[PDB]
């Protein structure tokens with residue numbers, strides 16, 4: 001591969017050209033001194049990046065030996081963990097000082113959307129998911145069940161449409177109540193002397209809380225829409241008797257529009273497959289078009305115009321406020337190598353290049369696309385403990401100097417998704433006291449790190465049992481406590497994890513309310529549709545109140561956090577073990593095959609119960625680590641795993657279209673071998689991470705497809 005020499009670095013030409021021709025134009029940064037900054041940061045910061053990675057292994061190996069050397073004594077285990085410096089002293093109370101953050105993060109509680117940056121349409125829809133149609137969300141999914149009468153089909157079904165309408169009217173009643181009567185019986189809306197007036201058949205009523213009236217469009221005496229607010233989220237009733245739905249409605253309502261994905265995370269990490277310069281350029285380019293505003297497949301929303309209750313004009317943001325998730329400290333990428341052929345740390349690159357690109361979002365498009373307060377929002381995943389957070393800080397300060405940006409311009413969304421972070425979370429937050437804009441429980445990764453850390457102690461409970469183990473319940477509460485106690489209320493997001501069941505929206509609406517009821521001012525959804533249905537929860541839960549009631553609680557002990565999810569003796573019949581194995585192998589195989597063969601890093605994979613699951617590297621990190629733990633402790637044999645992989649593989653072949661089967665020549669299929677390796681090599685991956693194998697096998701496939 002052809003490279004450009006800058007100092008000690010050899011930069012892949014496609015990446016060199018991309019920065020110079022596309023990313024640097026318009027930033028007033030001088031290209032020669034940008035690259036000089038790249039060279040200088042790489043050389044100054046690569047050693048400690050590597051030292052931190054060595055500390056991980058050195059710590060895991062001590063813990064390994066300790067478990068090998070009989071009901072686990074917690075007091076001894078605490079003190080060993082403290083002594084090897086795993087468990088560090090909790091610092092004294094403090095308050096974060098992160099300033100210049102936008103209202104969508106400091107103040108608004110609402111859904112947060114994660115989307116793979118390499119898919120421009122997905123990324124486009126996600127940036128546009130700030131507003132979404134409630135009707136579409138209910139008509140298109142199973143929130144409205146398809147009992148007799150209400151089935152979707154080729155044409156519009158009015159029995160279903162009616163239930164959609166009745167559902168939305170009750171949401172209005174429950175969110176923006178009338179002084180008397182129900183939106184179900186409304187026949188019209190007008191604005192009289194700056195106040196909302198709803199016409200019932202007998203009388204007429206106003207709002208039980210007139211402050212919930214935020215504006216309108218059209219003439220005040222028969223507006224084209226009425227705009228409400230509740231818990232800081234906007235609700236827009238679209239009024240159009242002319243339209244098909246509008247004609248049938250007792251008040252001519254066409255839709256209820258919900259402000260939904262308040263912020264969106266454009267993902268470079270677990271939900272994309274990017275193994276060289278060609279791949280990273282594609283991601284960087286899409287991130288560039290998002291920040292310049294001209295990304296198009298279909299284009300980015302402009303803000304929305306309203307008339308205030310008094311008759312003046314105002315505007316509301318039409319776009320999700322955009323985070324970008326960089327990769328973490330682990331991997332390297334040959335998009336840059338040095339003189340010796342050593343690859344450059346990929347995370348360092350993401351900070352330089354996603355940060356460079358982000359500057360366009362602070363500046364007028366073609367009107368400022370992203371942060372009006374002047375911040376750049378970078379999620380930093382998969383950090384292990386407070387020193388690794390301080391490293392990320394040091395990297396962002398050095399990249400700011402290279403880019404010419406005020407110090408602390410680059411904010412950090414801290415993932416709490418590694419065990420050494422969990423049990424040191426307070427010190428991890430303090431380590432970023434003036435950059436941190438959220439903490440979030442990345443429970444999937446956190447579950448993979450739970451299995452790997454304690455890989456030597458014994459067999460683990462089944463995957464489906466993890467969700468209710470004491471360590472994770474402690475971890476979710478301990479994350480809220482640490483957030484609230486560092487002054488996150490009004491300052492930074494307290495965020496929880498992802499709903500993976502992409503077609504079970506009835507279930508999501510019924511159960512995911514637990515997250516705001518637990519004091520989380522945001523949580524993760526995988527589609528704009530799911531963002532819309534998840535907004536409902538924030539209208540029913542007063543997260544501000546919930547957080548206020550939780551201040552000063554400390555609800556998890558370090559003992560509970562350290563409670564390893566060991567399986568109790570002989571808990572499983574032959575058929576239950578088989579199901580776990582089979583299921584784990586199916587999901588692994590389904591995800592890996594599109595990863596290695598097509599470069600898709602996030603796939604909907606049905607499971608053994610045919611539930612469609614949105615899989616990314618974290619869910620793969622759980623399934624691979626679990627089977628490696630069962631294999632390590634004799635729960636299954638190597639014959640079982642190879643048998644199960646061979647069994648599930650044709651099933652995966654069948655579920656797939658411009659695609660290459662894995663059966664029957666398993667030993668020919670790079671995708672099959674990668675899958676096999678994740679399991680049989682699983683205990684030897686650093687912290688169970690799946691990237692090392694996925695990258696090598698993706699690069700392996702790319703080379704084969706080119707000969």
Ligand SMILES: O=C(O)/C(O)=C/C(=O)c1cccc(O)c1
Pocket residue numbers: 114270271417441442443444445446497498500526602614615616618619
């Ligand atoms: O729990 C975590 O560790 C975490 O980071 C979650 C994800 O990245 C994610 C994104 C899309 C789909 C999915 O299933 C998971």
Ligand SMILES: [Mg+2]
Pocket residue numbers: 270381415417442444445618
């Ligand atoms: Mg994660």
Ligand code: NI
Pocket residue numbers: 231542
């Ligand atoms: Ni309320």
